[PDB]
């Protein structure tokens, strides 16, 4: 009815301990979602153009041109880590768990409130918020995944991370195909390169509408909604990082001269001269056996062009990389291609009392040492004469194509049948939890955005929209915008997300890295005197595991 609630708030996290070291983690989230009525009931096809910015020669990387269908619906997206876990729960998970399985997800909407704003014509303006006991909220669940998948975490548009702060949904839109060509240039390039928006290819047009593709429930103030329980099939994630690179794989060389005194400079010596040694190498014409030349079972990580932009039907896009940079842990200023950089606002981690439009940003320096250090790379001739002469070695200090600032590493690629790499580690709080596998015939090995990728399917996107509340003067043959009573809605969204984890075992003598509250970061996990709150980022793969 009207005065009877249709659900209960719940934001607790439960750890149910099972047999054989497994833990059933139940993350409950509950939010108060506020939704204004849409700008216009009509779907729009909007072409966004930034031809002004790109026209400046050498600025092609800043292309934003595209075409998108903008819809009257709003998306309720909970695909982010911060929605489910507070820093303490994440601390427990990372410090104690070794692997994380995604099990199930269900969500529901209850306690729907619809209100109308009546503004008086009094000389001093005033407005009063009445209820509307008959207005409806349209809720559509795309259980069949008939609509384009649009994860909001990539735009920091998921629900809030604070249970006590109301959150808003995101207006839904999806890309409409377009043809666009942009020939790159540089500062000082003469003339105007070909920079053109070509329209649309009819063979690719796709105009989706929620009304035609999904059943839409109408929820009055006394109604409820529940999506039911979906079950994932994603592969297990590891909360452990690998440190062994190719140089640390296998049996080290026996030391014939061990050190005899403590001290940093009292090194040990192998003894056998490098050309008189034993072992196996992939160098069929060289007698030298060294740690750099000795055969290894396979290659850890791979090299790829960094900051490479490739163009296609829709224009240029950065080539993604599956691993971070090398040595970034020693110097953050060297954090570069491959280390995801998250920007977010006051709903998703930034201090809630901050003023201004500037967002809060952080670069994630993954622990795993699967990355590369392109400055230490080099190529040398097949003859392998040592020391290598100038003409027989290509170095990162060598110009390629006549450019002083570009070297061979910028275009080098070593992905091969021997390559081995790890999945992207979870990013708290702003990291995405799951993502949809592509419908291509050959599917990518991993996604750079989510640790869980969806083999068959995973939960349909949930859409909400304030049903139109017409005035008596409605005339559908009028070309003007529909006349609607100012109406908004507030409804409680509750979700339950179920993981399964294994509790880690101490394999080694020494202790391992752990997350701990300390004097330097103490105040990031408590409110300020004026209620300000922030959710700083936390690393997720502290414990090390042996690669080989």
């Amino acid at each position: 009815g009207v005065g009877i609630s249709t659900g209960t708030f719940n934001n607790q996290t439960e750890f149910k301990f099972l047999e054989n070291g497994w833990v059933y983690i139940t993350a409950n989230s509950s939010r108060l979602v506020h939704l204004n009525m849409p700008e216009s009931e009509n779907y729009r096809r909007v072409v966004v153009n930034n031809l002004d910015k790109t026209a400046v020669n050498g600025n092609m990387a800043l292309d934003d041109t595209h075409a998108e269908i903008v819809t009257p619906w709003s998306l309720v997206d909970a695909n982010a880590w911060g929605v489910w876990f507070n820093p303490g729960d994440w601390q427990l998970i990372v410090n104690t768990m070794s692997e994380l399985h995604l099990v199930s997800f269900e969500q529901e909407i209850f306690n729907v409130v619809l209100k109308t704003v009546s503004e008086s014509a009094t000389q001093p303006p005033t407005k009063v918020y009445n209820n509307d006991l008959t207005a409806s909220l349209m809720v559509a669940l795309d259980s069949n995944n008939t609509m384009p998948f649009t994860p909001a975490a990539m735009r920091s548009e998921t629900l809030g991370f604070y249970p006590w702060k109301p959150t808003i949904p995101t207006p839904w839109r999806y890309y409409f195909q377009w043809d666009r060509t942009l020939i790159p240039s540089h500062t000082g390039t003469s003339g105007t390169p070909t920079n053109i928006y070509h329209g649309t290819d009819p063979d690719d047009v796709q105009f989706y509408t929620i009304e035609n593709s999904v059943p839409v429930h109408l929820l009055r103030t006394g109604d409820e909604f529940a999506t039911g329980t979906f079950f994932f099939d994603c592969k297990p994630c590891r909360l452990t990082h690998t440190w062994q690179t190719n140089r640390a794989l296998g049996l080290p060389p026996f030391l014939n001269s061990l050190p005899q005194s403590e001290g940093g400079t009292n090194f040990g010596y192998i003894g056998v001269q490098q050309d008189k040694r034993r072992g196996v190498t992939q160098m069929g014409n060289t007698n030298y056996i060294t740690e750099a030349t000795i055969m290894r079972p396979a290659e850890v990580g791979y090299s790829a062009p960094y900051y490479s932009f490739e163009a296609s039907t829709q224009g240029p896009f950065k080539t993604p990389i599956a691993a971070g940079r090398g040595g970034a842990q020693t110097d953050e200023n060297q954090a570069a291609d491959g280390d995801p950089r998250y920007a977010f606002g006051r709903q998703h981690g930034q201090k809630t009392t901050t003023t201004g439009e500037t967002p809060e940003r952080f670069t994630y320096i993954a622990h795993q040492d699967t990355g590369r250090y392109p400055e230490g790379d080099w190529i040398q001739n097949i003859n392998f004469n040592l020391p290598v002469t100038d003409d027989n070695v290509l170095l990162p200090t060598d110009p390629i194509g006549g450019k002083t600032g570009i070297n061979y590493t910028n275009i080098f690629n070593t992905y091969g049948p021997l390559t081995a790499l790890n999945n992207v580690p979870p990013v708290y709080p702003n990291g995405q939890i799951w993502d949809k596998e592509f419908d291509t015939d050959l599917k990518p090995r991993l996604h750079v955005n989510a640790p869980f990728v969806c083999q068959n399917n995973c939960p349909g996107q949930l859409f909400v929209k304030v049903a139109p509340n017409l005035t008596n003067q409605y005339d559908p043959d009028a070309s003007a915008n529909m006349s609607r009573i100012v109406t908004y809605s507030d409804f409680w969204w509750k979700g339950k997300l179920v993981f399964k984890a294994k509790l880690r075992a101490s394999h080694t003598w020494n202790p391992i890295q752990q997350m701990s509250i300390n004097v330097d970061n103490q105040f990031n996990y408590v409110p300020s005197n004026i209620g300000g709150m922030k959710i700083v980022y936390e690393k997720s793969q502290l414990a090390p595991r042996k690669l080989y």
Partner: nanobody, 132 residues
Framework: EGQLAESGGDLVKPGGSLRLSCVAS????????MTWVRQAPGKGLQWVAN????????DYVDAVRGRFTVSRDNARNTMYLQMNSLRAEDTAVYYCATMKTSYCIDENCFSFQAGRGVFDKWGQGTLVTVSS
């Protein structure tokens, strides 16, 4: 629709400095390539300078090179022209205008391409003179 509005033009002593302003109305200023042009009385239209939307690059004519400095403030939604080292030749009416960055191919404009050399909208203008 919104329009531009110039201000700051006036007689000033030769060799001095001044600062012309061009207020912009409408949401397109942050997205538009801005330009300054000047017209000496009964003379031919003379380009002064241009600056892109993001203040990434600036261009001037040799006649004002090293003397004029164009700048913009999206927070104030305005453009400015610092006319340092004023010279007798600066006496003219100065306008701020918008350079058309996109030109549509089909007459109904289902396809667009970048270009330069056409000014879409013009401001009111301000008169500047250089004399003692």
């Amino acid at each position: 629709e919104g329009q531009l509005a110039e201000s700051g033009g006036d007689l000033v002593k030769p060799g001095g400095s001044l600062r012309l302003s061009c207020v912009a109305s409408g949401s397109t200023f942050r997205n538009s390539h801005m330009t300054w042009v000047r017209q000496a009385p009964g003379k031919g239209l003379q380009w002064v300078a241009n600056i892109d939307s993001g203040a990434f690059t600036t261009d001037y004519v040799d006649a004002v090179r090293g003397r004029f400095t164009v700048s913009r403030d999206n927070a104030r939604n305005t453009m400015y022209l610092q006319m340092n080292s004023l010279r007798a030749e600066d006496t003219a009416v100065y306008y701020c205008a918008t350079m058309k960055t996109s030109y549509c191919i089909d007459e109904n404009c289902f396809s667009f391409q970048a270009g330069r050399g056409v000014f879409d909208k013009w401001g009111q203008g301000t008169l500047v003179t250089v004399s003692s």
